[PDB]
Amino acid sequence: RARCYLIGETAVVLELEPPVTLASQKRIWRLAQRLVDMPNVVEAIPGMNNITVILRNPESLALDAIERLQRWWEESERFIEIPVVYGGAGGPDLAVVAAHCGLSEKQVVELHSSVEYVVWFLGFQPGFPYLGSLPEQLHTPRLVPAGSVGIGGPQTGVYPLATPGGWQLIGHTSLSLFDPARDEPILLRPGDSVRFVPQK
Amino acid sequence: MLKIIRAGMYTTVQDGGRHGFRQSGISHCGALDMPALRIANLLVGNDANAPALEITLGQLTVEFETDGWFALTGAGCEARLDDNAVWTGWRLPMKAGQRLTLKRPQHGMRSYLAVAGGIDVPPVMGSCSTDLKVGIGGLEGRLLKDGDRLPIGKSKAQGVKQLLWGNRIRALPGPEYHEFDRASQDAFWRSPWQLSSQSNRMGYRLQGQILKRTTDRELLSHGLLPGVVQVPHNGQPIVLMNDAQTTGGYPRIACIIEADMYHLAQIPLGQPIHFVQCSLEEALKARQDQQRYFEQLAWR
């Protein structure tokens, strides 16, 4: 079931019950296109089975936001290949991640590449994907260079910036996920299908 | 056209904000004291969100090469222009070859400096706000240092009243307000909160009483905005500011209203902070009154 709570006086958060689902996130992606295509919505930030819609005219739209986002929710109407250079300097924890999972370096790079991941949402840093559902066999305990692929329990992703991280790094990427001067600054959008391509 | 001698400790080029990209993990940034920068740009004739220098604890000297007008807002640092003492909230004139010397202020924290025409720097994604974590905007995405020059744009003396600052800040409860026991909900309003040294442009860490949460249920990563007060496992509340994370998985006890966000910026690192329980009509009327206040400044 859905709940609609006011987050301050400028946003409304639509959430869903804790057992998350890919079908519920698909509608959240579909609603995030609809919400940003009108003048009254400054931003539409999706999360985990939830979407935060900030408003430009909250004085009128505030109470309406609890009656309107619930109804729009009842209606609920790309493929990118990232080149990852696994092991060596890019992935120093590749040897340690292969030890815990009980599979060699080639086996841990073969199933990590086989899974075609989808972007649930972007947050924390500019252009950082929360890639959902990593194989249950590849799960393992926890400044990192930019474009570094790493693992952290059930979560897997890429580091677009140079910041201190706790994930075990299994590889590195040359393709910039966040580039402030390209044309399309952020590569990944919510709902895109990420694939990781090995190189050595 | 604006040469810097002593830059200080945390000086940056700040704007209205890098909006439209919160969905892709980019913080909007901009001035912490948005009303201070807006009044300064208004006094000089620029657009209210034009690029102006943010200064933390004064200690700034800037030599002027081009003739025009300037203004100072925010915390009063007793600015001295060559052989005269200039004050905050005035469209002051400037000639070529004059230094403006700000000192460490006794009251307040952040001070703003705007010039006629605006600081012409490359607008990275419809904004010139410096993002120190990402390394973009302003002048190469970093703090201003000694010897740098910032190029002024092409412009094409009424004193205005500034806004008073205080330690009482109106916050609205929830979404996770009903997860804290009665001794923690009361302490949040009744008990004072001391500012910690960890507090920076991203988020303010508050030292006080240990707020106990009743539930131990995991929170799914949700979209955040400046002013949201998060309480981690340690029980010490963290106030999110402009450079904060767009997503987080911590329980949110309260949210500070946009009309009172400017007060946080001036609070010194050793002074307390009191929270006042607010209402939605009060939060919205207070937001209008401040938006309505800049329209009064626009008629001078």
Tab-separated table of N, CA and C in Angstrom, chain B residues 124-277:
chain	number	residue	atom	x	y	z
B	124	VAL	N	28.493	26.529	-14.998
B	124	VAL	CA	28.504	25.082	-15.179
B	124	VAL	C	27.121	24.521	-14.837
B	125	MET	N	26.332	24.172	-15.880
B	125	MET	CA	24.982	23.616	-15.770
B	125	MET	C	24.014	24.646	-15.136
B	126	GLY	N	23.879	25.780	-15.830
B	126	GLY	CA	23.017	26.899	-15.453
B	126	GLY	C	23.250	27.482	-14.073
B	127	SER	N	24.505	27.461	-13.586
B	127	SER	CA	24.855	27.968	-12.252
B	127	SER	C	26.373	28.108	-12.095
B	128	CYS	N	26.802	29.079	-11.273
B	128	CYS	CA	28.206	29.362	-10.978
B	128	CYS	C	28.551	28.981	-9.521
B	129	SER	N	27.658	28.240	-8.831
B	129	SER	CA	27.894	27.815	-7.452
B	129	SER	C	29.015	26.796	-7.378
B	130	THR	N	29.959	27.004	-6.454
B	130	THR	CA	31.114	26.124	-6.292
B	130	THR	C	30.725	24.869	-5.520
B	131	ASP	N	30.942	23.695	-6.131
B	131	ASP	CA	30.698	22.399	-5.503
B	131	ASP	C	32.071	21.835	-5.124
B	132	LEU	N	32.424	21.922	-3.835
B	132	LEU	CA	33.746	21.528	-3.340
B	132	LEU	C	33.934	20.007	-3.274
B	133	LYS	N	32.841	19.235	-3.126
B	133	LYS	CA	32.906	17.769	-3.090
B	133	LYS	C	33.040	17.196	-4.503
B	134	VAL	N	32.345	17.810	-5.474
B	134	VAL	CA	32.333	17.379	-6.875
B	134	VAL	C	33.496	18.002	-7.660
B	135	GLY	N	33.887	19.226	-7.312
B	135	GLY	CA	34.964	19.941	-7.989
B	135	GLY	C	34.531	20.621	-9.270
B	136	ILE	N	33.400	21.361	-9.221
B	136	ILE	CA	32.851	22.096	-10.370
B	136	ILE	C	32.333	23.470	-9.933
B	137	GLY	N	32.164	24.367	-10.902
B	137	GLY	CA	31.644	25.706	-10.665
B	137	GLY	C	32.618	26.664	-10.015
B	138	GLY	N	32.258	27.945	-10.048
B	138	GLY	CA	33.051	29.031	-9.485
B	138	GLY	C	34.370	29.228	-10.202
B	139	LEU	N	35.478	29.017	-9.487
B	139	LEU	CA	36.815	29.124	-10.050
B	139	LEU	C	37.509	27.776	-9.895
B	140	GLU	N	37.325	26.900	-10.906
B	140	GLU	CA	37.913	25.557	-11.002
B	140	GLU	C	37.403	24.560	-9.920
B	141	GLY	N	36.297	24.881	-9.243
B	141	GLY	CA	35.725	24.015	-8.215
B	141	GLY	C	36.581	23.871	-6.974
B	142	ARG	N	37.030	25.000	-6.413
B	142	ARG	CA	37.881	25.007	-5.221
B	142	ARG	C	37.749	26.321	-4.448
B	143	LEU	N	38.327	26.373	-3.239
B	143	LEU	CA	38.315	27.585	-2.414
B	143	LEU	C	39.223	28.640	-3.019
B	144	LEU	N	38.848	29.920	-2.917
B	144	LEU	CA	39.702	30.980	-3.441
B	144	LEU	C	40.976	31.029	-2.608
B	145	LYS	N	42.131	31.282	-3.256
B	145	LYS	CA	43.435	31.364	-2.586
B	145	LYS	C	44.067	32.741	-2.868
B	146	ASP	N	45.254	33.006	-2.295
B	146	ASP	CA	45.957	34.288	-2.457
B	146	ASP	C	46.527	34.435	-3.872
B	147	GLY	N	46.351	35.608	-4.471
B	147	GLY	CA	46.860	35.901	-5.808
B	147	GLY	C	45.907	35.717	-6.977
B	148	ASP	N	44.743	35.048	-6.789
B	148	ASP	CA	43.779	34.826	-7.886
B	148	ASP	C	43.020	36.107	-8.260
B	149	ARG	N	42.485	36.149	-9.505
B	149	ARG	CA	41.668	37.253	-10.033
B	149	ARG	C	40.368	36.698	-10.615
B	150	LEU	N	39.243	37.332	-10.283
B	150	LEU	CA	37.923	36.917	-10.737
B	150	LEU	C	37.407	37.974	-11.715
B	151	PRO	N	37.086	37.621	-12.982
B	151	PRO	CA	36.651	38.653	-13.948
B	151	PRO	C	35.197	39.139	-13.790
B	152	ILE	N	35.017	40.455	-13.675
B	152	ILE	CA	33.697	41.050	-13.490
B	152	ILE	C	32.978	41.166	-14.837
B	153	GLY	N	31.650	41.053	-14.799
B	153	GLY	CA	30.786	41.167	-15.966
B	153	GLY	C	30.470	42.612	-16.281
B	154	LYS	N	29.724	42.851	-17.354
B	154	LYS	CA	29.400	44.219	-17.758
B	154	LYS	C	28.014	44.649	-17.253
B	155	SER	N	27.957	45.590	-16.279
B	155	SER	CA	26.692	46.159	-15.796
B	155	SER	C	26.055	46.979	-16.914
B	156	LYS	N	24.718	46.985	-16.984
B	156	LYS	CA	23.981	47.702	-18.027
B	156	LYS	C	22.600	48.129	-17.533
B	157	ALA	N	22.815	55.670	-4.320
B	157	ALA	CA	23.313	54.743	-3.307
B	157	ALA	C	22.271	54.517	-2.197
B	158	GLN	N	21.222	53.734	-2.487
B	158	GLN	CA	20.154	53.472	-1.515
B	158	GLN	C	20.516	52.328	-0.565
B	159	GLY	N	20.444	52.595	0.731
B	159	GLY	CA	20.697	51.586	1.743
B	159	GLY	C	19.420	50.824	2.013
B	160	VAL	N	19.502	49.494	2.087
B	160	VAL	CA	18.332	48.652	2.378
B	160	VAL	C	18.513	47.967	3.733
B	161	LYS	N	17.401	47.724	4.446
B	161	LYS	CA	17.432	47.073	5.757
B	161	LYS	C	17.701	45.579	5.578
B	162	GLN	N	18.623	45.008	6.369
B	162	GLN	CA	18.937	43.581	6.321
B	162	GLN	C	17.980	42.830	7.251
B	163	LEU	N	18.043	41.477	7.261
B	163	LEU	CA	17.202	40.612	8.106
B	163	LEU	C	17.932	40.189	9.384
B	164	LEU	N	17.259	40.281	10.538
B	164	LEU	CA	17.903	39.905	11.795
B	164	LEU	C	18.035	38.398	11.909
B	165	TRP	N	19.155	37.959	12.490
B	165	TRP	CA	19.461	36.552	12.733
B	165	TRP	C	19.165	36.225	14.192
B	166	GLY	N	19.014	34.938	14.481
B	166	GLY	CA	18.739	34.448	15.826
B	166	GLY	C	19.082	32.982	15.991
B	167	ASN	N	18.940	32.464	17.217
B	167	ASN	CA	19.215	31.050	17.516
B	167	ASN	C	17.919	30.210	17.521
B	168	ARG	N	16.706	30.836	17.569
B	168	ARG	CA	15.432	30.106	17.522
B	168	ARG	C	15.051	29.847	16.057
B	169	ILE	N	14.863	28.570	15.683
B	169	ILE	CA	14.562	28.161	14.308
B	169	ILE	C	13.297	27.295	14.285
B	170	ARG	N	12.323	27.673	13.457
B	170	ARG	CA	11.062	26.945	13.335
B	170	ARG	C	11.230	25.674	12.508
B	171	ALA	N	10.996	24.501	13.119
B	171	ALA	CA	11.081	23.216	12.421
B	171	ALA	C	9.733	22.512	12.468
B	172	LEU	N	9.410	21.766	11.394
B	172	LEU	CA	8.176	20.991	11.264
B	172	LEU	C	8.477	19.516	11.552
B	173	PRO	N	7.667	18.810	12.363
B	173	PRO	CA	7.978	17.401	12.655
B	173	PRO	C	7.750	16.424	11.500
B	174	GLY	N	8.365	15.250	11.632
B	174	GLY	CA	8.108	14.072	10.809
B	174	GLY	C	8.884	14.056	9.530
B	175	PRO	N	8.808	13.012	8.679
B	175	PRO	CA	8.020	11.751	8.645
B	175	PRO	C	8.251	10.745	9.791
B	176	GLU	N	9.488	10.577	10.314
B	176	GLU	CA	9.771	9.610	11.397
B	176	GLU	C	9.731	10.253	12.806
B	177	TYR	N	8.843	11.222	13.048
B	177	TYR	CA	8.747	11.902	14.349
B	177	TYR	C	8.076	11.007	15.378
B	178	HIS	N	7.112	10.171	14.939
B	178	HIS	CA	6.371	9.279	15.826
B	178	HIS	C	7.121	7.940	16.104
B	179	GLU	N	8.430	7.847	15.738
B	179	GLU	CA	9.301	6.715	16.085
B	179	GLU	C	10.182	7.012	17.325
B	180	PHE	N	10.212	8.269	17.824
B	180	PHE	CA	11.008	8.662	18.993
B	180	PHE	C	10.112	8.746	20.235
B	181	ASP	N	10.601	8.259	21.392
B	181	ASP	CA	9.839	8.264	22.651
B	181	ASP	C	9.502	9.707	23.095
B	182	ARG	N	8.657	9.864	24.126
B	182	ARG	CA	8.211	11.188	24.599
B	182	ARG	C	9.346	12.055	25.185
B	183	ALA	N	10.432	11.435	25.684
B	183	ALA	CA	11.568	12.173	26.249
B	183	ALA	C	12.481	12.769	25.170
B	184	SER	N	12.408	12.234	23.938
B	184	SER	CA	13.213	12.666	22.792
B	184	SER	C	12.467	13.730	21.966
B	185	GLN	N	11.129	13.570	21.790
B	185	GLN	CA	10.283	14.552	21.094
B	185	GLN	C	10.296	15.872	21.875
B	186	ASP	N	10.179	15.803	23.225
B	186	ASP	CA	10.226	16.987	24.101
B	186	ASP	C	11.611	17.631	24.085
B	187	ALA	N	12.672	16.825	24.262
B	187	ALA	CA	14.054	17.312	24.240
B	187	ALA	C	14.378	18.063	22.939
B	188	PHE	N	13.815	17.644	21.791
B	188	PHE	CA	14.095	18.306	20.513
B	188	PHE	C	13.631	19.770	20.487
B	189	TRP	N	12.536	20.092	21.198
B	189	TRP	CA	11.992	21.447	21.260
B	189	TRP	C	12.491	22.175	22.509
B	190	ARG	N	12.459	21.506	23.673
B	190	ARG	CA	12.843	22.129	24.942
B	190	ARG	C	14.355	22.265	25.114
B	191	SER	N	15.120	21.198	24.846
B	191	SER	CA	16.569	21.180	25.082
B	191	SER	C	17.378	21.957	24.014
B	192	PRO	N	18.432	22.715	24.402
B	192	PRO	CA	19.235	23.429	23.399
B	192	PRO	C	20.220	22.498	22.705
B	193	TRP	N	20.582	22.815	21.455
B	193	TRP	CA	21.503	22.013	20.648
B	193	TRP	C	22.765	22.800	20.310
B	194	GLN	N	23.946	22.314	20.744
B	194	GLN	CA	25.223	22.985	20.494
B	194	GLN	C	25.783	22.569	19.135
B	195	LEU	N	26.361	23.516	18.379
B	195	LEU	CA	26.963	23.200	17.083
B	195	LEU	C	28.349	22.547	17.280
B	196	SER	N	28.645	21.519	16.470
B	196	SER	CA	29.903	20.774	16.530
B	196	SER	C	30.866	21.225	15.434
B	197	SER	N	32.177	21.041	15.672
B	197	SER	CA	33.254	21.383	14.725
B	197	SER	C	33.158	20.646	13.360
B	198	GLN	N	32.491	19.473	13.305
B	198	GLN	CA	32.281	18.708	12.062
B	198	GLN	C	31.398	19.452	11.052
B	199	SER	N	30.500	20.311	11.553
B	199	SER	CA	29.569	21.110	10.759
B	199	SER	C	30.266	21.929	9.673
B	200	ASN	N	29.851	21.738	8.411
B	200	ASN	CA	30.418	22.437	7.257
B	200	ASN	C	29.288	22.776	6.267
B	201	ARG	N	29.619	23.098	4.998
B	201	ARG	CA	28.618	23.436	3.978
B	201	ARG	C	27.683	22.259	3.630
B	202	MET	N	28.111	20.996	3.835
B	202	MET	CA	27.266	19.828	3.561
B	202	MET	C	26.166	19.658	4.613
B	203	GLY	N	26.548	19.383	5.860
B	203	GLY	CA	25.586	19.171	6.937
B	203	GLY	C	26.105	19.520	8.316
B	204	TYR	N	25.234	20.109	9.154
B	204	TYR	CA	25.571	20.519	10.519
B	204	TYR	C	25.329	19.398	11.526
B	205	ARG	N	26.355	18.997	12.303
B	205	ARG	CA	26.213	17.986	13.367
B	205	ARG	C	25.909	18.701	14.697
B	206	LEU	N	24.824	18.313	15.393
B	206	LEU	CA	24.396	18.972	16.624
B	206	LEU	C	24.737	18.151	17.865
B	207	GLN	N	25.394	18.773	18.858
B	207	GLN	CA	25.726	18.141	20.139
B	207	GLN	C	24.637	18.427	21.175
B	208	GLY	N	24.075	17.386	21.775
B	208	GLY	CA	23.051	17.562	22.795
B	208	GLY	C	22.678	16.278	23.503
B	209	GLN	N	21.360	16.013	23.653
B	209	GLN	CA	20.830	14.826	24.340
B	209	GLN	C	20.663	13.632	23.380
B	210	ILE	N	20.779	12.402	23.911
B	210	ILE	CA	20.671	11.173	23.105
B	210	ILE	C	19.195	10.856	22.806
B	211	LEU	N	18.766	11.144	21.567
B	211	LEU	CA	17.387	10.927	21.147
B	211	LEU	C	17.171	9.442	20.889
B	212	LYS	N	16.347	8.784	21.714
B	212	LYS	CA	16.076	7.352	21.553
B	212	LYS	C	14.942	7.108	20.568
B	213	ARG	N	15.167	6.228	19.573
B	213	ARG	CA	14.155	5.800	18.613
B	213	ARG	C	13.599	4.473	19.109
B	214	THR	N	12.280	4.277	19.018
B	214	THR	CA	11.644	3.038	19.471
B	214	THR	C	11.848	1.882	18.472
B	215	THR	N	11.745	2.160	17.156
B	215	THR	CA	11.889	1.123	16.133
B	215	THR	C	13.349	0.920	15.755
B	216	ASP	N	13.647	-0.305	15.301
B	216	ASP	CA	14.945	-0.720	14.788
B	216	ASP	C	14.765	-1.162	13.321
B	217	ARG	N	13.725	-0.654	12.622
B	217	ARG	CA	13.410	-1.053	11.251
B	217	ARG	C	14.303	-0.278	10.246
B	218	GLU	N	14.849	-0.972	9.222
B	218	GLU	CA	15.748	-0.348	8.243
B	218	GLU	C	14.987	0.583	7.304
B	219	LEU	N	15.547	1.771	7.069
B	219	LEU	CA	14.933	2.763	6.202
B	219	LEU	C	15.490	2.659	4.791
B	220	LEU	N	14.592	2.587	3.793
B	220	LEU	CA	15.000	2.500	2.393
B	220	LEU	C	15.505	3.890	1.950
B	221	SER	N	16.568	3.951	1.128
B	221	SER	CA	17.151	5.231	0.676
B	221	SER	C	16.109	6.149	0.007
B	222	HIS	N	15.874	7.328	0.612
B	222	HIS	CA	14.864	8.291	0.170
B	222	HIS	C	15.484	9.628	-0.143
B	223	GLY	N	14.853	10.353	-1.064
B	223	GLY	CA	15.286	11.683	-1.467
B	223	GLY	C	15.275	12.648	-0.301
B	224	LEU	N	16.310	13.504	-0.215
B	224	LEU	CA	16.500	14.497	0.843
B	224	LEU	C	16.521	15.909	0.269
B	225	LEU	N	16.426	16.913	1.153
B	225	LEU	CA	16.502	18.329	0.784
B	225	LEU	C	17.101	19.137	1.937
B	226	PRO	N	17.686	20.327	1.679
B	226	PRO	CA	18.255	21.118	2.787
B	226	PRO	C	17.226	21.449	3.864
B	227	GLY	N	17.652	21.385	5.123
B	227	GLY	CA	16.808	21.645	6.282
B	227	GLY	C	16.303	20.411	7.003
B	228	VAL	N	16.398	19.220	6.379
B	228	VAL	CA	15.931	17.977	6.997
B	228	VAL	C	16.906	17.576	8.111
B	229	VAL	N	16.368	17.284	9.301
B	229	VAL	CA	17.161	16.901	10.465
B	229	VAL	C	17.130	15.380	10.584
B	230	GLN	N	18.266	14.714	10.294
B	230	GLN	CA	18.401	13.259	10.399
B	230	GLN	C	18.992	12.892	11.740
B	231	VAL	N	18.594	11.744	12.309
B	231	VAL	CA	19.124	11.262	13.587
B	231	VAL	C	19.718	9.861	13.375
B	232	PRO	N	21.052	9.693	13.252
B	232	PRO	CA	21.604	8.336	13.083
B	232	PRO	C	21.510	7.472	14.360
B	233	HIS	N	22.229	6.334	14.388
B	233	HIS	CA	22.224	5.410	15.539
B	233	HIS	C	22.809	6.031	16.816
B	234	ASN	N	23.731	7.001	16.675
B	234	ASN	CA	24.352	7.687	17.820
B	234	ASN	C	23.369	8.593	18.627
B	235	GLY	N	22.252	9.010	18.020
B	235	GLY	CA	21.248	9.844	18.677
B	235	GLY	C	21.469	11.344	18.583
B	236	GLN	N	22.535	11.789	17.882
B	236	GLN	CA	22.861	13.202	17.713
B	236	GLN	C	22.305	13.684	16.370
B	237	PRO	N	21.403	14.689	16.360
B	237	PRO	CA	20.800	15.123	15.083
B	237	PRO	C	21.770	15.832	14.118
B	238	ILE	N	21.613	15.579	12.794
B	238	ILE	CA	22.428	16.162	11.718
B	238	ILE	C	21.508	16.978	10.806
B	239	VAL	N	21.730	18.301	10.712
B	239	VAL	CA	20.926	19.190	9.870
B	239	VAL	C	21.556	19.252	8.488
B	240	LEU	N	20.817	18.865	7.450
B	240	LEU	CA	21.345	18.902	6.087
B	240	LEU	C	21.296	20.326	5.555
B	241	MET	N	22.364	20.780	4.873
B	241	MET	CA	22.444	22.131	4.316
B	241	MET	C	22.434	22.033	2.770
B	242	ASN	N	22.986	23.024	2.045
B	242	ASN	CA	22.894	23.073	0.581
B	242	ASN	C	23.749	22.026	-0.168
B	243	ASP	N	25.008	21.768	0.249
B	243	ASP	CA	25.888	20.789	-0.420
B	243	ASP	C	25.632	19.325	0.022
B	244	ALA	N	24.620	19.055	0.880
B	244	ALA	CA	24.298	17.711	1.388
B	244	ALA	C	23.976	16.677	0.303
B	245	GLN	N	23.937	15.402	0.728
B	245	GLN	CA	23.549	14.257	-0.098
B	245	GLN	C	22.123	14.402	-0.609
B	246	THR	N	21.840	13.964	-1.847
B	246	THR	CA	20.462	13.988	-2.337
B	246	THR	C	19.641	12.793	-1.800
B	247	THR	N	20.286	11.631	-1.502
B	247	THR	CA	19.617	10.426	-0.978
B	247	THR	C	20.257	9.964	0.338
B	248	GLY	N	19.442	9.439	1.251
B	248	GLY	CA	19.908	8.933	2.539
B	248	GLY	C	18.935	7.970	3.180
B	249	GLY	N	19.456	7.115	4.055
B	249	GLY	CA	18.677	6.102	4.755
B	249	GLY	C	18.706	6.245	6.260
B	250	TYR	N	18.518	7.480	6.769
B	250	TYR	CA	18.474	7.758	8.209
B	250	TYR	C	17.086	8.279	8.606
B	251	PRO	N	16.628	8.017	9.850
B	251	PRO	CA	15.293	8.493	10.255
B	251	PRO	C	15.264	10.015	10.458
B	252	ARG	N	14.329	10.697	9.768
B	252	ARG	CA	14.161	12.149	9.769
B	252	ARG	C	13.160	12.585	10.853
B	253	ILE	N	13.655	13.209	11.926
B	253	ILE	CA	12.803	13.659	13.030
B	253	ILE	C	12.072	14.969	12.695
B	254	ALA	N	12.754	15.958	12.079
B	254	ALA	CA	12.142	17.252	11.761
B	254	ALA	C	12.718	17.859	10.487
B	255	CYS	N	12.059	18.902	9.969
B	255	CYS	CA	12.495	19.615	8.769
B	255	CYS	C	12.372	21.110	9.011
B	256	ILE	N	13.488	21.840	8.886
B	256	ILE	CA	13.535	23.290	9.080
B	256	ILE	C	12.913	23.976	7.858
B	257	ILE	N	12.085	25.001	8.109
B	257	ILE	CA	11.384	25.725	7.045
B	257	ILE	C	12.367	26.624	6.290
B	258	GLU	N	12.151	26.782	4.976
B	258	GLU	CA	13.010	27.581	4.089
B	258	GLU	C	13.170	29.051	4.549
B	259	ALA	N	12.150	29.629	5.215
B	259	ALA	CA	12.220	31.006	5.717
B	259	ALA	C	13.228	31.164	6.875
B	260	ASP	N	13.540	30.081	7.626
B	260	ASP	CA	14.475	30.121	8.762
B	260	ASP	C	15.842	29.491	8.450
B	261	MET	N	16.031	28.913	7.250
B	261	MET	CA	17.313	28.309	6.868
B	261	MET	C	18.472	29.308	6.910
B	262	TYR	N	18.215	30.598	6.610
B	262	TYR	CA	19.262	31.622	6.617
B	262	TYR	C	19.854	31.836	8.025
B	263	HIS	N	19.090	31.565	9.106
B	263	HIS	CA	19.599	31.736	10.473
B	263	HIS	C	20.749	30.759	10.811
B	264	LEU	N	20.692	29.502	10.310
B	264	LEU	CA	21.719	28.468	10.574
B	264	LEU	C	23.125	28.935	10.130
B	265	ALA	N	23.201	29.601	8.959
B	265	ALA	CA	24.433	30.087	8.331
B	265	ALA	C	25.242	31.020	9.217
B	266	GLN	N	24.587	31.844	10.057
B	266	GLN	CA	25.296	32.804	10.898
B	266	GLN	C	25.632	32.280	12.286
B	267	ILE	N	25.048	31.156	12.719
B	267	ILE	CA	25.293	30.632	14.069
B	267	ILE	C	26.764	30.203	14.259
B	268	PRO	N	27.509	30.807	15.225
B	268	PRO	CA	28.907	30.384	15.450
B	268	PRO	C	29.059	28.923	15.907
B	269	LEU	N	30.276	28.367	15.763
B	269	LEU	CA	30.569	26.961	16.076
B	269	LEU	C	30.484	26.579	17.588
B	270	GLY	N	30.371	27.553	18.491
B	270	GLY	CA	30.219	27.294	19.919
B	270	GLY	C	28.891	27.706	20.528
B	271	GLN	N	27.985	28.360	19.759
B	271	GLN	CA	26.699	28.848	20.277
B	271	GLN	C	25.572	27.818	20.128
B	272	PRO	N	24.586	27.815	21.055
B	272	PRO	CA	23.477	26.853	20.954
B	272	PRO	C	22.474	27.187	19.845
B	273	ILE	N	21.541	26.243	19.594
B	273	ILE	CA	20.455	26.349	18.606
B	273	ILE	C	19.167	25.804	19.230
B	274	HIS	N	18.083	26.598	19.236
B	274	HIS	CA	16.787	26.159	19.769
B	274	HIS	C	15.820	25.890	18.630
B	275	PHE	N	15.041	24.807	18.734
B	275	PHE	CA	14.036	24.466	17.730
B	275	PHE	C	12.650	24.848	18.246
B	276	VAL	N	11.830	25.447	17.377
B	276	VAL	CA	10.463	25.861	17.693
B	276	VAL	C	9.502	24.978	16.887
B	277	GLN	N	8.470	24.409	17.533
B	277	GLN	CA	7.484	23.578	16.822
B	277	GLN	C	6.573	24.479	15.976
